[PDB]
């Protein structure tokens, strides 16, 4: 008889085990590239002395050696360079084979069969299917990270921490990325399968798979829905019929899986973060270490000019023009890996936006950009780098627009507000991280500015009174809300002000809602004198038109005669009323654990619609929903559920608690699940 | 001023997509016969009352009305019969003119010239020139065929499946008809201008290009180069020194363009598909719907009253005499149009056979013969129906004959082994459609018996029939049969009888030529078993690569015979003719394909042999995704090494395109690869 192949055993566990791919929920055999992986493949008789075994594993839909998305290889005693196949050991009919692949192989699936040249004839038998994944661990990749517990950070930890709020007080949401859950990682690799660049090119776009700064790009474009392509949907209008209000979601899971089961239409809808925490799951799950990042108070310079434009009416309200100009906060994603293109001052951390913002080439991508090129203002190298260099060092000008007259008039310039508190998630805690030396150079500093000249050179070669609005006692969704005009006169003189003030409930990233109040006053002030004006605003004038971001824009404008009109803002942040979340026993895995959710309602009146979401990777198999009944005024909800731990360690139980006089409100809950 | 053309416009890209000829790569003006087309004149004046035009139409050295390869018609208002020109409109200078043709003009090219009638005078110009086909769209012609479907594969289709190998297992080989590509359909015009008959009396032989069971005749003549006259040379020899193996063809494009380039001599060289492919190919181009058969187990000797004689010796080895009598697989062609020499009951297909075997009227060619005629025995119309009906009915008697004693005596008689899975391509797939049912009756019906005796009739002692042979044999294949490979039959034997019988065995292995060229002994062995009352015994058949690596051609076969005796009774002559499959050629595109954008191709070949193989050429091609021909030299290929080739084809007619491609080595002769590829605008 003619040799053959009787069984071959993948030995999956061992090999995803030292490939650190055994977290994944699939039963598949998961592979890091540049790594040996053994196999045991028992023949029908004895490797003969002029029988030869050649190795055929090929990717994509156009397997060709010359693009190495596909590679033949014989069985040696010896290892080649690329792909090789060593037999390290024969007994009996059974072959001890162990077989490598080349650092810079493409990414994806990959398909493996078998040649036999015996007794003069050739045959042919598929052996199996695995995946390859980028190899953080591997010297040699590109995606390359040496120390250890940054490598569990950026790849292993499925729960995540993503800053929010404003630069008067940063919060924080939980976010569970999943990549390990069940179909997560094969829905992240099929999103190479539906890129534009796939369509356009299938050949071409497999091939280049090998490369994370494409892999990233592409990934930057396909996480949003924009050109008819894409995951999410983007939606910053305060109005989310139709969809799910952006805040409500508490992890990358039930979007993707969500996009998969509607036969990829638009998830609806998603905002920044989102967006971010979904990147960062898709690059995780695919082997490139990944972090969130929160640049607060981030501009989006429009004309490539490094400033942005705000603008105000005399009756102290803000104009949509430049309304949303510069967010409270914007969030994006950081990819690492080396910059052959760039050279080797770039490599390391990578910024990669989702966000459909600017269009790039065409298309909603953005990155990778170097942080250390964006440091120091190299914003000729790709890509992207003049919007995001500006998104943290633009200047913001302030001006006073009369539409009656026609008239406008610049009011002032701040060369620092915008690009503060750039934060992320510490290794191994839910600590804050601030990054922001690591995207600009100090105020103040004279690098600062001799980057920004650089930088904007590459791109295009007094007053007697001072304002500040501040915050009364405690701000919470259902209480009125209570700030004091501060006003102080540095002049000389006796001055006499007049102040025109507004209040506008505003979506995070500045768009205009409803106006909820509004005053006026005349102040006479003496030389050093100080004086206060009560702002009071009841839960019946904002609650009619406040959204899920719980923010109001404070403004006032001030002027005296014969002086420039000052300008005092504040966008002000009302929390939910408090959720809490609390197990009632000790946390085992595979052990049922009961857990309570606490929730009283504030209001005068009762609350319904009432929506309870609770997920967690490694506490619960997917989405947890339950409907709670209406809940009286002053009354309390006690709402219990089991969740079941499957993998120990540190563990995050979200929650989101939805109803109709308050939504999205949020819950996270840190668990240690013991063996 | 007298009336006078100032010039013309033949509309070509109009009429030649009403016409159905615009897939023709060239620029003239291409028409099929019967149908109107329209042209633009434009004159120096208004067209005078007392004026008149006369159109001109000739073809061949010698124009006459009378033999209607020339016709004079004026410019009327209303059409008429034969050609006829009609002024539909007229604006300024401008006339607006729709030409007709009779359904039963000559085909081939044509001059057109004007005559203009004015102020009492006579002037003459000539317009110009164009193609007239025959026109299967045309309910009136003779080569009309109705069905859309059948029409578009038996006329426009330039992608072919010829079906080859044996009756123990049917392969099948692309062939690139290519009746579109540059110079094809002028080239297979000249055909008819050089034929004998043409030659003889081209007066007579233009005024018969009306008629398509002429044309189709002469093509049959001329697709082989016997008499001094025509395309293809067969070699049926093994050896082809000096020519080109004829399995290592894909198309018919190559041979014609190399026969016009050599200025007409000899094409070496062709066998039976070549020479149907190639004729498949001028029949298509010409508009005679037309499709290749292969008859296996063909009789192609047969001349003495529908019966073939095969002879072996008593030590197992096929005799030459009749070892060619009946081919594994004969291919040849068929053409659709009425028989209006024969009556209504024979139109449809009509048998044309190219391959050189029986003269008919003094030369080599063969056909029409009507299909329909040959299923009911009626030899006796016009043409070569005799022949054709023993290809397919012939009674097959195997002989034994010893040499030392001059000896020799009848085995067997097989009335039903000659005639079998007749095939051609399906409408629209590659499916093998069988059309066996169309030439004969099913064997052990009647009908088939009544005609065979009629058939007989029409042509043109005691043989004591003993009992039960009582020992039975058949050969049968174990494992794969691959070239490189060792062979391995069994030899099954069974006393029926009941007395235990002791069998004397003889056998022999033969390379062949697919037709029954015996090319040489790589094997032959002898036994002596007792057998047992209902006993059965096998005896194992190996030849080693070694054995018959030296004596194997292109044909991959090799015939296998065992002749079995016992004691006082008959011999049982065991024969079967194997097929070794050449190694494993692929072609993959390594992209989606698309119309005038490159896209690359893979060829993918692995050595099986423990020696090296050398002087490797690879030949493409395919209508449609490449001009011509792509001739690739390959390194010398080591032992189980693999051949990496990458090219490039550029599509230029979207549809579903076929590529083709042969590998040919030192060690493996003519290697086939096939693939179909959808290209998209
Ligand atoms: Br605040
Ligand atoms: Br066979
Ligand atoms: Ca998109
Ligand atoms: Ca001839
Ligand atoms: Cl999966
Ligand atoms: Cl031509």
Redesign the interface.
């Known amino acids: 008889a003619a040799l053959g192949v009787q069984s071959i055993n993948w030995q999956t566990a061992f090999n995803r085990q030292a490939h650190h791919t055994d977290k994944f929920s699939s039963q598949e055999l998961i592979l890091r590239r540049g790594q040996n992986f053994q196999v045991l493949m028992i023949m029908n008789k004895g490797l003969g002395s ?1 029988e ?1 075994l ?1 190795f055929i594993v090929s990717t994509g839909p ?1 397997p ?4 190495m998305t596909k590679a ?1 290889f014989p069985l040696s005693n010896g290892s080649s360079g690329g792909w090789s196949a060593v037999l390290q050991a024969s007994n009996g009919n059974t072959l001890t084979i162990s077989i490598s692949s080349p650092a810079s192989a493409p990414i994806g699936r990959y398909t493996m069969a078998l ?1 036999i ?1 015996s ?4 045959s042919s038998v598929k052996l199996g299917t695995f995946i390859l994944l980028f190899n953080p661990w591997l010297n040699v990749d590109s995606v390359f990270m040496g120390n250890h517990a940054e490598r569990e950070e950026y790849v292993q930890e499925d729960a995540g921490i993503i800053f929010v709020g404003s630069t008067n007080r940063i919060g924080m949401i939980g976010w569970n990325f999943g990549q390990f859950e069940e179909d997560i990682l094969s829905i992240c690799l099929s999103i190479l399968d539906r890129s534009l660049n796939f369509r356009r ?3 071409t776009d497999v091939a280049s798979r090998n490369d994370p700064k494409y892999v990233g790009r592409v990934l930057s474009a396909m996480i949003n829905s924009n050109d008819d392509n894409g995951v999410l949907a983007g939606n910053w209008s305060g109005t989310y019929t139709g969809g799910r209000d952006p805040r409500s979601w508490d992890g990358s899971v039930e979007i993707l899986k969500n996009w998969k089961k509607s036969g990829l239409s638009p998830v609806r809808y998603g905002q920044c973060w989102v967006f971010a925490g979904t990147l960062n799951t898709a690059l995780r799950s695919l082997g490139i270490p990944s972090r969130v990042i929160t640049n607060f108070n981030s501009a989006h310079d429009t004309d490539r000019n490094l400033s942005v434009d705000v603008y105000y009416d005399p009756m102290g309200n803000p104009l949509d023009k430049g309304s949303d100009s510069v967010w409270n906060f914007h969030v994006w994603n950081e990819g690492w890996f080396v910059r052959s293109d760039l050279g080797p001052s770039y490599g390391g951390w990578q910024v990669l936006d989702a966000t459909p913002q600017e269009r790039s080439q065409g298309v909603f991508q953005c990155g990778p950009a170097s942080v250390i090129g964006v440091r120091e203002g190299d914003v000729q190298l790709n890509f992207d780098m003049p919007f995001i260099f500006a998104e943290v060092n633009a200047d913001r000008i302030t001006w006073l627009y009369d539409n009656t007259t026609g008239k406008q008039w610049k009011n002032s310039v701040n060369s620092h507000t915008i690009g503060r508190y750039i934060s992320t998630k510490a290794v191994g805690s839910n600590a804050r991280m601030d990054v922001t030396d690591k995207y600009k150079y100090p105020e103040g500093s004279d690098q600062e500015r001799q980057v920004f000249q650089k930088a904007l050179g590459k791109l295009k070669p007094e007053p007697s009174i001072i304002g500040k609005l501040k915050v009364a006692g405690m701000l919470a969704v259902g209480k009125e809300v209570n700030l004091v005009l501060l006003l102080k006169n540095l002049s000389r003189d006796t001055k006499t002000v007049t102040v025109n003030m507004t209040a506008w409930t505003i979506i995070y990233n500045g768009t205009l809602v409803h106006e909820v109040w509004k005053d006026s006053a005349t102040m006479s002030l003496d030389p050093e004198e100080e004086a206060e004006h009560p702002i009071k605003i009841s839960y019946a004038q904002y609650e009619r038109y406040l959204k899920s971001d719980n923010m109001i824009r404070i403004t006032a404008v001030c002027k005296v005669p014969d002086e420039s009109e000052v300008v005092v803002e504040r966008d002000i942040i009302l929390d939910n009323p408090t959720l809490t979340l609390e197990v009632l026993n000790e946390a085992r895995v595979r052990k049922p654990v009961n857990v309570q959710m606490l929730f009283s309602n504030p209001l005068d009146e009762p609350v319904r619609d009432c929506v309870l979401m609770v997920e967690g990777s490694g506490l619960l198999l997917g989405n947890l929903k339950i409907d709670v009944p209406t809940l009286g005024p002053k009354e309390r909800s006690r709402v219990r559920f089991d969740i079941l731990p499957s993998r120990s360690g540190t563990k995050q139980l979200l929650a989101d608690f939805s109803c109709n006089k308050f939504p999205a409100i949020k819950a996270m809950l840190s668990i240690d699940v013991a063996e």
């Open positions: 002029n030869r050649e156009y060709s050696e010359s693009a033949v040649q040249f007794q003069g004839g050739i090119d299938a050949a």
